[PDB]
Amino acid sequence: ARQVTIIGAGLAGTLVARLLARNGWQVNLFERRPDPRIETGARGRSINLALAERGAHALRLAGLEREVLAEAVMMRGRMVHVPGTPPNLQPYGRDDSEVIWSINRDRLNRILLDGAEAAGASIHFNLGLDSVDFARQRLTLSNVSGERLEKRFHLLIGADGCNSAVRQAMASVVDLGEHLETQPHGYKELQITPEASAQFNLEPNALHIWPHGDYMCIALPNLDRSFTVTLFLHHQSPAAQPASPCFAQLVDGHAARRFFQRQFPDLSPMLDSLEQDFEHHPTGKLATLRLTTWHVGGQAVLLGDAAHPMVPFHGQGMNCALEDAVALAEHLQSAADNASALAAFTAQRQPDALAIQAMALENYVEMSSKVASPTYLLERELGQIMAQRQPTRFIPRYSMVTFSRLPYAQAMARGQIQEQLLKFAVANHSDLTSINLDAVEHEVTRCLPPLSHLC
Ligand SMILES: Cc1cc2nc3c(=O)[nH]c(=O)nc-3n(C[C@H](O)[C@H](O)[C@H](O)COP(=O)(O)OP(=O)(O)OC[C@H]3O[C@@H](n4cnc5c(N)ncnc54)[C@H](O)[C@@H]3O)c2cc1C
Ligand SMILES: Nc1ccccc1C(=O)C[C@H](N)C(=O)O
């Protein structure tokens, strides 16, 4: 049987472990953290994530989608909150098939671990990779105390996240050609209890947003009607707007409460544990990292966040990472040798990772605006008529990304054509009735070939 060692029993690494093990491979998976299925007296984990069609499809191929969705809350649309003003759903799509799902991250990881073991993978926890000797084909791991132990490997998969040690180790033998692009927002996890959720009548089946321009909060629902909230806020005030809010001014929980009472006056009273959460949850950093090189011959490959860290504003990191896992397993299963598989996987996935990294960055401005332009509104209206006239040609970029499996680069390219056609058609008009609709439709059929078999 073909042998593989995967570093990182997170979301992509556990999926790819199940796909390879079930297809005959002898799989060993090493994870730095303890096994989250071993119950302890520690506090419960509250991070959740949006699962969309790309990740759900990956799970479906793995036979795990039904299990994960039984523990997921449907989000039918965005619920945008701006003070005093009543929220109204902006639905994601036309019916409940076009929804995204809110799932507890720890639960998803526990379901994936059970899936990898059921397929025959061996998982070893409390061992973090420290280094790799590619010439000798040996790995060095240690527990939290740092005491080193070595393991031989044959094929190494780095599914070890944004600060991947496999990627770091690859720098010793290849030029990674890395481009690290910092992003100025940090983030902080907060919580709305089930009682406050109900008191303030927050719709459970929606993604909630409190836009505020250069900062914003989002909230995703849990099965118990609590919401996990994330504040995105600059670490530091930029040189030009030097008094503007940032994490550096929020020196403690009390300061954070004042900031929320001033800037998010409607959300603040929903957040009972703000002061505590602010002080005990560390502030997270965001970044986009692009790498020229994702593999070393047939010996080692990166996927998921180890290959392509991205900013979180599209909710697609996990979805892309599970899509990567499926592609990697497909290439490894059927290729002439591991070197061929890994080069082909990389060539396939790199243009798509670049496109979703860019679209993620672009998604911030959308989400964080308190008010949409009249121009933007009219473009959206016209787009809705086009989608109705030509649903296999005009499919909004958001939907191509979230509700289909169209390669991300293609979704980006078609989104660009759509953006230009709407922009030119709406210019110098203030309403639909002044727009030549057939002429727009003619540009749609001229410029956008039909796609079948999308949903
Ligand atoms: C604030 C925020 C919100 C997000 N929201 C969404 C969302 O709504 N939807 C979505 O699709 N994505 C979202 N993401 C992105 C998602 O969290 C990641 O893209 C996804 O977890 C990547 O999966 P992965 O398997 O590559 O990495 P991970 O799931 O991070 O797993 C790597 C695993 O590596 C283990 N490990 C790390 N280093 C070592 C080592 N040296 N040795 C052994 N093990 C190691 C880590 O402990 C771990 O278990 C969000 C990200 C952030 C930061
Ligand atoms: N779901 C998320 C979870 C966390 C961070 C962002 C998102 C998103 O906003 C993606 C979704 N389609 C959205 O754009 O509304």
439: nearest Cα among 372, 365, 385: 385
Asked whether residue 155 falls in the same domain as residue 179, the answer is: yes
Ligand number nearest to the C-alpha of 80: 2
Asked whether residue 327 falls in the same domain as residue 386, the answer is: no
d(CA 286, CA 183): 6
Check the annotation: does 33 bind a ligand: yes
Residues 6+ apart with CB under 8 A from 422: 379, 382, 383, 386, 440
Amino acid (1-letter code) at residue 110: R
Best residue for ligand 2 mutational test, from 99, 102, 108, 207 (most atoms within 8 Å of Cβ)? 207
β-sheet bridge partners, residue 233: 186
CATH of the domain at 319: 3.50.50.60
4: nearest Cα among 135, 154, 120: 154
Asked whether residue 392 falls in the same domain as residue 368, the answer is: no
Sheet of 48-51: strands edge to edge? 48-51, 100-104, 72-75
Asked whether residue 28 falls in the same domain as residue 150, the answer is: yes
Last-in-domain residue among 372, 407, 437: 372
- Map tokens 């303890």 to a residue: 34
Q: What are the pocket residues of ligand 2 if the criterion is a CB atom closer than 6 Å to any ligand atom?
A: 50, 78, 100, 207, 218, 220, 312-315, 363, 367, 402
Asked whether residue 305 falls in the same domain as residue 288, the answer is: yes
Whose CA is closest to atom 51 on ligand 1?
312
118: nearest Cα among 35, 62, 59: 62
d(CA 409, CA 386): 22
Last-in-domain residue among 341, 372, 403: 372
Radius of gyration over alpha carbons of the chain, in Å? 23
Asked whether residue 339 falls in the same domain as residue 386, the answer is: no
Question: Residue 195: what are its φ and ψ, rounded to 5°?
Answer: -65, -45
Amino acid (1-letter code) at residue 172: S
Asked whether residue 30 falls in the same domain as residue 173, the answer is: yes
d(CA 97, CA 313): 22
Give residue 155's domain range: 1-372
Check the annotation: does 328 bind a ligand: no
β-sheet bridge partners, residue 220: 228
Best residue for ligand 2 mutational test, from 102, 286, 363 (most atoms within 8 Å of Cβ)? 363
Which 3-state string (H, E, C) describes the chain?
CCEEEEECCCHHHHHHHHHHHCCCCEEEEECCCCCCCCCCCCCCCCCEEEECHHHHHHHHHCCCHHHHHCCEEEECEEEECCCCCCCCCEECCCCCCCCEEEEEHHHHHHHHHHHHHHCCCEEECCCEEEEEECCCCEEEEECCCCCEEEEECCCEEECCCCCCHHHHHHCCCCCCCCEEEEEEEEEEEEEECHHHHHHCCCCCCCEEEEEECCEEEEEEECCCCCEEEEEEEECCCCCCCCCCCCHHHCCCHHHHHHHHHHHCCCCHHHCCCHHHHHHHCCCEEEEEEECCCCEECCCEEECHHHCCCCCCCCCCHHHHHHHHHHHHHHHHHHCCCHHHHHHHHHHHHHHHHHHHHHHHHHHHHHHHCCCCCHHHHHHHHHHHHHHHHCCCCCCCHHHHHHHCCCCHHHHHHHHHHHHHHHHHHHCCCCCHHHCCHHHHHHHHHHHCCCCCCCC
d(CA 94, CA 105): 27
Whose CA is closest to atom 52 on ligand 1?
312
Asked whether residue 205 falls in the same domain as residue 131, the answer is: yes
Ligand number nearest to the C-alpha of 311: 1
- For residue 387, report the distance from its CA to the centre of ligand 2, in Å: 22
- For residue 438, report the distance from its CA to the centre of ligand 2, in Å: 34
- Map tokens 């892309």 to a residue: 320
Ligand number nearest to the C-alpha of 51: 1
Last-in-domain residue among 372, 392, 408: 372
| 54: Cα within 13 Å, side-chain hemisphere | 27
d(CA 229, CA 219): 4
Check the annotation: does 50 bind a ligand: yes
Q: What's the number of domains the chain is made of?
A: 2
Query: CB of 387 within 8 A of CB of 381?
Result: no
Asked whether residue 300 falls in the same domain as residue 206, the answer is: yes
- Tokens representing 10 are 């997170």
Find the length of the chain. Answer: 455
* CB of 17 closer than 6 angstroms to any ligand 1 atom: no
Asked whether residue 340 falls in the same domain as residue 388, the answer is: no
Best residue for ligand 2 mutational test, from 48, 79, 188, 218 (most atoms within 8 Å of Cβ)? 218
- For residue 36, report the distance from its CA to the centre of ligand 1, in Å: 15
Whose CA is closest to atom 21 on ligand 1?
318
Residues 6+ apart with CB under 8 A from 377: none
Ligand number nearest to the C-alpha of 106: 1
Asked whether residue 275 falls in the same domain as residue 395, the answer is: no
Asked whether residue 290 falls in the same domain as residue 413, the answer is: no
- Tokens representing 189 are 């996890």
